[PDB]
């Protein structure tokens, strides 16, 4: 300490031992003159808080930590964002799926079914755990319109659906059917329901996480899940309620065996055989939980909690112009490679709420009335509308009063410092409303 | 940045007077005659008129 303290500035007098320099964006004189073209995730600040000098002029002056000692500073910071649930940036507004796109009676008498992969995109916005799903199913439909239907494709065969129920609760071990004649609409984890010849890929989307279907060994570029994969676990068919009820008057067999085939407005349930009790529709959930664990999807995939945020990602601070470049970091000027002084999780959590609207809706569509762009197939038990789970989650932004350690810094702090927040991939982050830094230099050793 | 670099500096130690070896590679392509090296002009005195 002794002669090694002195923290000096132009003529303003000697200050001794730790003090405080401030890194702030909202500083009025600065904005107008320096970071006009920049944004909160990468700006310039005048660290000289002296009322009498131009910002430019200040950019000349310097804070001089005494030369005789290696100094260090404590970096506390206040980060506050407002990034939405889904958006193009975090890759939560896109997802490739393969659907039916054409159905025509080929040239002889046999038929043709051609499928294709299409990328559907969501309208940017902050959503629910559910409404997001819905938005996806809708985006599937919206396509069936611009193309599908108008080419021999019947809703009775739309290839992909994201629902949320255990399509085999009512199931009866012997009858081979969902006895109650209705797939019990309770919510049990996001799922994926496919059809023959199609599937979905998330290779470039974090939405996967929203669903909660994670790859059992992630570091494998690529995420395709198709029909052939979902093996063992095709949605069993609903038993014919009426045929059964209507019977019992007059070897003497009963109406049981009759597995419903279609529903009001005659929508095909595409059953494998005119025999088998299983429909062609295949569910991930079903597969994972019910089909061979050592071979099924239960093998290469993992069932887990949703998380609307789509994945806690972190950000990296960098104060290139004011702090020594940490161990192996190379010093540069390429914004997308500055040295990093602190890491921290991007300020987003998921609040959970109890859903009353769970059942309230089961007592309104039972009393017929209009429909949403979401339940375009009310009377279908499958292309219906996935049941709203009790307890929805919602991505919520929150101020993060974080605190990075104490770092080594240069002893000639420039009048104008540059602040820069970066993300995992290394790029500014548009969704930053406020960055604030406080540094407290203090002597560490001697030269 | 090049600009930014223009700020930084190479510091040969202060306590000693330094020196450097300067090797250089120069390559031209100047032509024989040209206006610059003054090889494209030359004054001469000639006959310009003949009348009785």
From Swiss-Prot, chain A:
Induction: Expressed in the late phase of the viral replicative cycle. One of its GO terms (cellular component) is host cell nucleus. It comes from Human adenovirus C serotype 2. Interacts with the fiber protein (via N-terminal tail region). Interacts with the capsid vertex protein; this interaction binds the penton base to neighboring peripentonal hexons. Interacts (via the cell attachment site RGD) with host heterodimer ITGAV-ITGB5; this interaction promotes virus internalization. Interacts with host WWP1 and WWP2. Keywords: Capsid protein, Clathrin-mediated endocytosis of virus by host, Host nucleus, Host-virus interaction, Late protein, Phosphoprotein, T=25 icosahedral capsid protein, Viral attachment to host cell, Viral penetration into host cytoplasm, Virion, Virus endocytosis by host, Virus entry into host cell. The modification Phosphoserine is found at residue 333. The keyword Metal-binding does not apply. The keyword Phosphoprotein applies. GO terms for molecular function: structural molecule activity. Signal peptide: none annotated. GO terms for biological process: clathrin-dependent endocytosis of virus by host cell; virion attachment to host cell. All late proteins expressed from the major late promoter are produced by alternative splicing and alternative polyadenylation of the same gene giving rise to non-overlapping ORFs. A leader sequence is present in the N-terminus of all these mRNAs and is recognized by the viral shutoff protein to provide expression although conventional translation via ribosome scanning from the cap has been shut off in the host cell. The cell attachment RGD motif is exposed at the virion surface and is involved in binding to the integrin heterodimer ITGAV-ITGB5. This is Penton protein. Belongs to the adenoviridae penton family.
Curated annotation (Swiss-Prot), chain B:
It is found in: Virion; Host nucleus. Induction: Expressed in the late phase of the viral replicative cycle. Major capsid protein that self-associates to form penton base pentamers, each in the shape of a pentagon, situated at the 12 vertices of the pseudo T=25 capsid. Involved in virus secondary attachment to host cell after initial attachment by the fiber protein. Binds host integrin heterodimer ITGAV-ITGB5 (alphaV-beta5) thereby triggering clathrin-mediated endocytosis of virions. Mediates initial virus attachment to CXADR-negative cells. Binding to integrins ITGAV-ITGB5 also seems to induce macropinocytosis uptake of the virus. Interacts with the fiber protein (via N-terminal tail region). Interacts with the capsid vertex protein; this interaction binds the penton base to neighboring peripentonal hexons. Interacts (via the cell attachment site RGD) with host heterodimer ITGAV-ITGB5; this interaction promotes virus internalization. Interacts with host WWP1 and WWP2. The cell attachment RGD motif is exposed at the virion surface and is involved in binding to the integrin heterodimer ITGAV-ITGB5. All late proteins expressed from the major late promoter are produced by alternative splicing and alternative polyadenylation of the same gene giving rise to non-overlapping ORFs. A leader sequence is present in the N-terminus of all these mRNAs and is recognized by the viral shutoff protein to provide expression although conventional translation via ribosome scanning from the cap has been shut off in the host cell. Belongs to the adenoviridae penton family. This is Penton protein. The gene is L2. The chain holds residues 102 to 153 of 571 of the full protein.
């Amino acid at each position: 300490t002794g002669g090694r303290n002195s923290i000096r500035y132009s003529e303003l007098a000697p200050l001794f031992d730790t003090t405080r320099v401030y890194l702030v964006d909202n500083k009025s004189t600065d904005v107008a003159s320096l970071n006009y073209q920049n944004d909160h995730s990468n700006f310039l600040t005048t660290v000289i808080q002296n009322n009498d000098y131009s910002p430019g002029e200040a950019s000349t002056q310097t804070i001089n930590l005494d030369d005789r000692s290696h100094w260090g500073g404590d970096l506390k910071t206040i980060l506050h964002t407002n990034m939405p649930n889904v958006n193009e940036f975090m890759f939560t507004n896109k997802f490739k799926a393969r659907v039916m796109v054409s159905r025509s009676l080929t040239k002889d008498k046999q038929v043709e079914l051609k499928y294709e992969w299409v990328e559907f995109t969501l309208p940017e916005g902050n959503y629910s755990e559910t409404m997001t799903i819905d938005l996806m199913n809708n985006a599937i439909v919206e396509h069936y319109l611009k193309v599908g239907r108008q080419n021999g494709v019947l809703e009775s065969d739309i290839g992909v659906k994201f629902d949320t129920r255990n399509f085999r609760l009512g199931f009866d071990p012997v009858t081979g059917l969902v006895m109650p004649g209705v797939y019990t609409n309770e919510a049990f984890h996001p799922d994926i329901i496919l059809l023959p010849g199609c599937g979905v890929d998330f290779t470039h989307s974090r939405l996967s996480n929203l669903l909660g279907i994670r790859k059992r060994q992630p570091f494998q570029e690529g995420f395709r899940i198709t029909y052939d994969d979902l093996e063992g676990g095709n949605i069993p068919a609903l038993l014919d309620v009426d045929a059964y009820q209507a019977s019992l008057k007059d070897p003497q067999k009963k109406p049981v065996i009759k597995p419903l085939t279609e529903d009001s407005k005659k929508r095909s349930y595409n059953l494998i055989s005119n025999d088998s009790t299983f429909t062609q529709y295949r569910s991930w959930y079903l597969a994972y939980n019910y089909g061979d664990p050592q071979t099924g999807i239960r093998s290469w995939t993992l069932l887990c909690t949703p998380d609307v945020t789509c994945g806690s990602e972190q950000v990296y601070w960098s104060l290139p112009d004011m702090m020594q470049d940490p161990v192996t970091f190379r010093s540069t000027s390429q914004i997308s490679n500055f040295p990093v002084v602190g890491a921290e999780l991007l300020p987003v959590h998921s609040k959970s709420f109890y859903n009353d609207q769970a059942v309230y809706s089961q007592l309104i569509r039972q009393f017929t009335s209009l429909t949403h762009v979401f339940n375009r197939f009310p009377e279908n038990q499958i292309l219906a509308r996935p049941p709203a789970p009790t307890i929805t989650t919602v991505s919520e932004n929150v101020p993060a009063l974080t605190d990075h350690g104490t770092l080594p810094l240069r002893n000639s702090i420039g009048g104008v410092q540059r602040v820069t927040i970066t993300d995992a991939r290394r790029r500014t982050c548009p969704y930053v409303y406020k960055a604030l830094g406080i540094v407290s230099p203090r002597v560490l050793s001697s030269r």
